[PDB]
Amino acid sequence: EIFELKAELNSDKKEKKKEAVKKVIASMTVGKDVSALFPDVVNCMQTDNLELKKLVYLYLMNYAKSQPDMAIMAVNTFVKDCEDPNPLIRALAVRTMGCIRVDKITEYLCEPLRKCLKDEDPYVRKTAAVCVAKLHDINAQLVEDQGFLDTLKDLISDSNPMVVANAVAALSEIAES
């Protein structure tokens, strides 16, 4: 079971890795403590398949608070994924960076947040605004130091009206707290 899943995840077969990820996701949804296999899935994280990347990001987000120490092996992967040409991959990386409740994880994600703040894609802009709002909620001092208030304010008077609305909502949420 657990040993077989770990062996499958520690293999070089894409089908076996996908099957192991699906089994881990099903166990997690069914009520199985799969946080012990998070370090094993850390190595099998940088994958070309988008389906496996989403599952890995979801496992890391759900296994970030449980194993904050094991989450230090994903900062490089997050930084690499933040520059992905695909807008969906960049948006997913931005969402996962802000969804990880790690005190030392958001500190290293300030540079990716600043890089994605000026994203031309309206979806990328909305994801960056959401990540900035999440960082401000988790750490208001970190958000103030990063100077994301000016970027959020300027997002309102830009294009991408959905992105403008997302930035306005993020600014209101920051001001609400």
């Binding site: 293999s11 092996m73 490089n76």
Partner: protein, 180 residues
């Protein structure tokens, strides 16, 4: 059982091989991996985690797993040691103060029972300035000749120039692959 399919696959090349990317920070490990995979010296951000890439040469796909030399990433090299067949160590000949740290890290990595079948792969990184040591002084300082039961080879490679990477890859292939 029949091994006709295996023979057919091996006739045109089936062996892949493995490799590792370990060493001190700013020792050219990432640059060496980029040169092996791409062939250019590209500046990269510090390796907080690890870099995963594959290089195909001589019909063998020698995948290289970059490992940072940071303090928070130095103890994480054991995680990448699992399911790994090769290991390449990049030495910093221009960092005399960090030379002792690199030698200690290499000794600690080679002093593990799990990492026993992997031959030593010492690359003389930063081999472009006069302060860089030769292929024997660096090995003597690191004590590569005293690594019993380990096939350690000292090679000098310059990240900017890229010379010696082909020789190191050929030596690694010869050490790993023992076929015609």
């Amino acid at each position: 059982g029949n091994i006709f399919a295996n023979l057919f696959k091996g006739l045109f090349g089936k062996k892949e091989m493995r490799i590792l990317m370990v060493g001190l920070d700013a020792a050219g490990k990432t640059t060496i991996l980029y040169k092996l995979k791409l062939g250019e010296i590209v500046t990269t951000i510090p390796t907080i985690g690890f870099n995963v890439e594959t290089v195909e040469y001589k019909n063998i796909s020698f995948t290289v797993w970059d490992v940072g030399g940071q303090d928070k990433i130095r103890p994480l090299w054991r995680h990448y040691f699992q399911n790994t067949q090769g290991l390449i160590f990049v030495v910093d000949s221009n960092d005399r103060e960090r030379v002792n740290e690199a030698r200690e890290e290499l000794m600690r990595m080679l002093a593990e029972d799990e990492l026993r079948d992997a031959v030593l792969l010492v690359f003389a990184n930063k081999q472009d300035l006069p302060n860089a040591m030769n292929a024997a002084e660096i090995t003597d300082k690191l004590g590569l000749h005293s690594l019993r039961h380990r096939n350690w080879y000292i090679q000098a490679t310059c990240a900017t120039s890229g010379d010696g990477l082909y020789e190191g890859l050929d030596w690694l292939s010869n050490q790993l692959r023992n076929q015609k």
